[model samples]
Target: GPLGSMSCVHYKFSSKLNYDTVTFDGLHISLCDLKKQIMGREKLKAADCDLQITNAQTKEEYTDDNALIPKNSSVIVRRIPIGGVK
Candidate 1:
């Protein structure tokens, strides 16, 4: 086993018809951080994107930014509803 906050967890990230697998430090990473990280990696403008994550199997939505995720879990990602506001 590894030492000192070594939590190499896997999570599923998706947007519409696509999905991705990413490694996460489940012990330390927060939901907000995760969202922003993926956003940055995907070249999504954080200011223009708003996402809501939920359990794909049970239809449970997540709201807490600093929450612990379960191992081997697959979730759904969707953009928050709201038309372009310029």
Candidate 2:
């Protein structure tokens, strides 16, 4: 099987309650990285990760020249932090 693929998950900081789906397209995980950065937490879980697979780029357009300004998308995840004793 020549399992070949060209895609990576994309994520960005967001304060809005919902993801801006129109400006982008991909899976939405909801609330990324917020659970791992909490203060006063004795223990914590690993931060959530998201991705945006590249499906629209042309073969030629997916070259290094276009990589600098390539398209992307993201998602967010939710989690709770262990409280207290900061």
Largest TM-score belongs to which candidate?
1
Task: Write one digit per residue (lDDT tens) for candidate 1, span 1-86.
Answer: 14444543334456446455445655545668766766777777667666567766666777676654443445666656334653
Candidate 2 lDDT over 1-86, as tens digits, reads: 11123323332224335432322122222222222222113233333322112223332221121232222433232232224321
**Which lDDT value does model 2 have at 39?**
16
Q: What lDDT is reached at residue 17 by model 2?
A: 57
RMSD of each: 4.2, 15.0
What is the C-alpha local distance difference test score of each model? 0.58, 0.27
TM-score of candidate 1 to 2 decimals: 0.62
* Candidate 2 ranges beyond 4 A from true positions: 1-4, 14-73, 77-79, 82-86
Q: Which of the numbered candidates is closest to the native, going by highest lDDT?
A: 1
Candidate 1 residue pairs that clash = none
lDDT of 2: 0.27
